[PDB]
Amino acid sequence: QFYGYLSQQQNMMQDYVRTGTYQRAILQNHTDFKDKIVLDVGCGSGILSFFAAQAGARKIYAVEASTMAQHAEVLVKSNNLTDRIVVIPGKVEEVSLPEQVDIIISEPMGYMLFNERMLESYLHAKKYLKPSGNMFPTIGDVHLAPFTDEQLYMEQFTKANFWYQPSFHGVDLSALRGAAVDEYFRQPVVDTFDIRILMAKSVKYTVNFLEAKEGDLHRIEIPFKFHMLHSGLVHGLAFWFDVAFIGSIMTVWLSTAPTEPLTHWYQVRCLFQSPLFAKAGDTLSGTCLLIANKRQSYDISIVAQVDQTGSKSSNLLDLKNPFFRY
Amino acid sequence: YFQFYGYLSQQQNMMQDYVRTGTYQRAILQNHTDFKDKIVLDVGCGSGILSFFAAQAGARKIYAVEASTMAQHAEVLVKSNNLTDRIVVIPGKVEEVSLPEQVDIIISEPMGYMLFNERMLESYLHAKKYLKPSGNMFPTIGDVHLAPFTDEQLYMEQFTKANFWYQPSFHGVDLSALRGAAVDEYFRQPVVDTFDIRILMAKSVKYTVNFLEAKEGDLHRIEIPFKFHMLHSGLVHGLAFWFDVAFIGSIMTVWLSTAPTEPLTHWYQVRCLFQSPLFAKAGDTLSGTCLLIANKRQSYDISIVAQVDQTGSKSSNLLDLKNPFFRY
Ligand SMILES: CCc1ccncc1CNCCCCSC[C@H]1O[C@@H](n2ccc3c(N)ncnc32)[C@H](O)[C@@H]1O
Numbered sequence A: 001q002f003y004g005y006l007s008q009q010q011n012m013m014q015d016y017v018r019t020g021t022y023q024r025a026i027l028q029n030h031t032d033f034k035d036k037i038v039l040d041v042g043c044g045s046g047i048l049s050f051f052a053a054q055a056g057a058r059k060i061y062a063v064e065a066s067t068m069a070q071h072a073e074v075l076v077k078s079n080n081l082t083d084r085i086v087v088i089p090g091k092v093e094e095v096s097l098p099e100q101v102d103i104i105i106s107e108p109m110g111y112m113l114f115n116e117r118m119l120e121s122y123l124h125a126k127k128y129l130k131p132s133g134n135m136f137p138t139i140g141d142v143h144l145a146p147f148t149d150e151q152l153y154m155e156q157f158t159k160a161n162f163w164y165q166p167s168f169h170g171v172d173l174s175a176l177r178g179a180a181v182d183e184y185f186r187q188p189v190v191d192t193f194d195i196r197i198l199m200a201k202s203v204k205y206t207v208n209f210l211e212a213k214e215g216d217l218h219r220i221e222i223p224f225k226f227h228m229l230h231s232g233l234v235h236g237l238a239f240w241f242d243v244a245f246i247g248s249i250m251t252v253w254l255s256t257a258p259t260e261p262l263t264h265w266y267q268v269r270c271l272f273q274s275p276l277f278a279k280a281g282d283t284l285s286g287t288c289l290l291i292a293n294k295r296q297s298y299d300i301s302i303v304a305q306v307d308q309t310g311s312k313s314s315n316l317l318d319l320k321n322p323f324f325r326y
Numbered sequence B: 001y002f003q004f005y006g007y008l009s010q011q012q013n014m015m016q017d018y019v020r021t022g023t024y025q026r027a028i029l030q031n032h033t034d035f036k037d038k039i040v041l042d043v044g045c046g047s048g049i050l051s052f053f054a055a056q057a058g059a060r061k062i063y064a065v066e067a068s069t070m071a072q073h074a075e076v077l078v079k080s081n082n083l084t085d086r087i088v089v090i091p092g093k094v095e096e097v098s099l100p101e102q103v104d105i106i107i108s109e110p111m112g113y114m115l116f117n118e119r120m121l122e123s124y125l126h127a128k129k130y131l132k133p134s135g136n137m138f139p140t141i142g143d144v145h146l147a148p149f150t151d152e153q154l155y156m157e158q159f160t161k162a163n164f165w166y167q168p169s170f171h172g173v174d175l176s177a178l179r180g181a182a183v184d185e186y187f188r189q190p191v192v193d194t195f196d197i198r199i200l201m202a203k204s205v206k207y208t209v210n211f212l213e214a215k216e217g218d219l220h221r222i223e224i225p226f227k228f229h230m231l232h233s234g235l236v237h238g239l240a241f242w243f244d245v246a247f248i249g250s251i252m253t254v255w256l257s258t259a260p261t262e263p264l265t266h267w268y269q270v271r272c273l274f275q276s277p278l279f280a281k282a283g284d285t286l287s288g289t290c291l292l293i294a295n296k297r298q299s300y301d302i303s304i305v306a307q308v309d310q311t312g313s314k315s316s317n318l319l320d321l322k323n324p325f326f327r328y
């Protein structure tokens, strides 16, 4: 229902970097839309389907599982486009298209790209794509980089140490302190930061939406080896994402990087249980394993070590309970 | 819900409300004779804090019932506080568990926004199947207060939002057909924040639920009639709601107030705007009905009808306590 509120649709429609970038990607690639058949997966209010119609699309199937499909239908009648935009209420996995499409368009990106698991519906929809058909967005780049943030690490313990007291109104809470720390460290942090907390150049993990299958997103293994630019304590990994619309005329990027004006995706940070001392020139190696979970999110398993010392840390986070710290 | 209250962070958030936790402890300890050597039921005990207060008051036995995974953390604190002989955590819904015996007193903190939100009072009232005749409830009564308010800033903040949907060319697209649906959605949102008491245009009307007498089914449909003698002239933008609970013990009555004349709590106050404000004069009477109907989303469909009796000026709103506006 969350996406079923006009207020929620307004917040994303009003977001210029999101909505304006999609319009630019589509209108500046008019040859990928001029007289084509289009699928808009999770169209919400239908704004992306209108942009395709502005670019000259012959037919646009606009699929929406929420009751927003009803409001999208009103906008298409109201905009005199019932001949070119057909709104199909229901799940993209369960509806019927009358024909194969030239191009699929969607805004399925969650926090850290993968959160909400909508990329699975986007990829599922390629059963409707013509061989040599296009995907907008075409690729997603997930960037991860080690960060130092003593204050963000220490505040976990400030919060958890609420339980480390022998007489909260006469009650010894101290037996729960360990569980409270564990629960706080299992929360990915959604907020932004100064790029100078980054201790190494990002590693990039690329999903090619033309090639990737639905099941590819159930388990995402991101090996990393960071060459440390700075000496300090590594508190965790920072995550962001770019997507590219690779059209016939040009590639348009939507970036959520900390070097770009802040978006409503912010960036995501996952703390280590224990920070790792690295000197500039050291290598920090390990694996980030994203495992799709039953709460339309991911279990995040990180293991990392400073190769030169053998110092090792890990964390297990659930992207379903993020801490909005902004 | 059985997830949300399942987080230690959420338990810490609530325990850290000192007015909430301190008033509960004061109600129980200053009424220790209502607990001493008695059998207690704590409905939805979370971390177990009210069961500990009952144990401090000298309760012989306390059944602490909890549906969420928080039940396991409560059992850890009962062992670490050496009260295994006094507090018995019973995992599950108070509707579906068996207790070995009837209780002298039920305790709970089941109050949501506007008292009724989250519909936990139904489980609190259900629990009375376990209450001995001449058993007590803590809290014993809930007083819902409503008063008409004026707030032009608040009214316009919300029209500033809906008028997004009046645009006939948003990136070339005509949104105006949805203007009506947007206004209704935005004005369905109860506003959760505090305010200065000088925005109130009349003395509050009080609606009293007696938890000793009420039946679970009584909370499916709640009809609150009101008649305000207006003390100021101006635009009524809606009704402000708050609530007190009273712990009516054998030694004293202790009140927990979320009144705007009182220290702020995590309950704040709740305002239900009218789509069109009502002009009234000092001395006019503003009457009508707040009707609360229980929905499948563990909440209420709220209908408010209000009229200035002297003019026939009448206003409506439907409100969706499922989609509050947290303005604070
Ligand atoms: C906070 C991240 C963020 C930050 C900034 N700006 C935006 C965002 C959110 N980006 C989109 C994430 C993806 C969320 S779902 C997008 C749309 O798809 C619909 N749906 C859901 C399932 C489904 C299905 N199987 N078949 C068809 N439709 C389906 C939803 O009802 C919704 O309208």
Ligand SMILES: CCc1ccncc1CNCCCCSC[C@H]1O[C@@H](n2ccc3c(N)ncnc32)[C@H](O)[C@@H]1O
Binding pocket: B001, B002, B005, B006, B013, B014, B017, B020, B043, B044, B045, B046, B065, B066, B067, B068, B070, B092, B093, B094, B095, B109, B110, B111, B112, B113, B118, B120, B123, B266, B267
């Ligand atoms: C901070 C004050 C505040 C301010 C603003 N708004 C809300 C609040 C919270 N006030 C309590 C509302 C009541 C929330 S539920 C309270 C506890 O009861 C548990 N449960 C739920 C159903 C149930 C059942 N059938 N049988 C036993 N247990 C049950 C929950 O798992 C939870 O631990």
